[PDB]
Design an enzyme around this catalytic site. Structure first.
Site, PDB file in Angstrom:
ATOM      1  N   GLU A 106       0.825  -1.200   0.000  1.00 38.33           N
ATOM      2  CA  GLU A 106       0.000   0.000   0.000  1.00 38.33           C
ATOM      3  C   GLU A 106       0.863   1.256   0.000  1.00 38.33           C
ATOM      4  OE1 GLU A 106      -1.771   1.331   3.713  1.00 38.33           O
ATOM      5  OE2 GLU A 106      -1.021  -0.491   4.679  1.00 38.33           O
ATOM      6  N   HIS A 126     -10.664   3.739   3.662  1.00 38.70           N
ATOM      7  CA  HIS A 126      -9.918   2.979   4.657  1.00 38.70           C
ATOM      8  C   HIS A 126     -10.001   1.481   4.413  1.00 38.70           C
ATOM      9  CE1 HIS A 126      -9.280   6.553   7.275  1.00 38.70           C
ATOM     10  NE2 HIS A 126      -8.146   5.885   7.402  1.00 38.70           N
TER      11      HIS A 126
END
Lengths: 108, 108
Positions: free
Chosen positions: B71, B100
Site C-alpha cells: 500500500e 480505509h
C-alpha cells in the site's frame, strides 16, 4: 491482548472491528459482571468493555447523518473501570478521552 | 512530488517502485513520527507513508500464490493520514481505496 490507544486505533482502521478481547457491557453483565463490585477480571479475564454505542449526548464529537459513534475501554486490566476510552465512528474517525468523556482529542 | 492516484500508478507500472517521496511506517517511526499526534509533515516534510505490506486480511484483493500486495498513501500533504490508498501487487495490478480499505476498485 490489544488494549492500547495506538494498537486499538490501528486495528479499527484496518480491520474495521475491535480486537477479540472486547465485550459489550450487555455481554459482560450476562457473565456476572457487577460494576459496583469491580469484578470484570474475575468473570471475564483478559477482556475489556468495548463496542457499545456512544450516544454523544453533548454533541462533543463531530456529528453527521448516518455516522455512528462507539466506545471501548483502553488500558484496562482489572478492578473498577478506568477513565480511558477510545471513541470511533462508522467512518473510522478515532478520538480519545482520558477524563470520562469530558474532553476528546483526535488520534486518527 | 508524485502523490496522486494516476501519477503513482503509472510510476509503479513503468519503474516498478514508489517515487522517492515515500517512506514506510517503520522508517517514519524512526524519524519521530507519532501517529496519534499527526506530525509526519514536521518530522519528514514532503514524505508520505507507503511501501508497506498489505496483508489483505479480508481477501478483498485478488489473491494468488506468490503475489504480494503493498500500500501507499495518496493525496497526503500534512496532518493526520487520510483515507486514500493505492494498493499494488508484485505483478503490478493497481487498485485504489478511498474508504480505509473497505472497498477497492481497479485503476490499472
Amino acid at each position: 491482548v490489544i488494549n492500547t490507544f495506538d494498537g486499538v486505533a490501528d486495528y479499527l482502521q484496518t480491520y474495521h472491528k475491535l480486537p477479540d478481547n472486547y465485550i459489550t457491557k450487555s455481554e459482560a453483565q450476562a457473565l456476572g459482571w457487577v460494576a459496583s463490585k469491580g469484578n470484570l477480571a474475575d468473570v471475564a479475564p483478559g477482556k475489556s468493555i468495548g463496542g457499545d454505542i456512544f450516544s454523544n449526548r453533548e454533541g462533543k464529537l463531530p456529528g453527521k447523518s448516518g455516522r455512528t459513534w462507539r466506545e471501548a475501554d483502553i488500558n484496562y486490566t482489572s478492578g473498577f473501570r478506568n477513565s480511558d476510552r477510545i471513541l470511533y465512528s462508522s467512518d473510522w474517525l478515532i478520538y480519545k478521552t482520558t477524563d470520562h468523556y469530558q474532553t476528546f482529542t483526535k488520534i486518527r
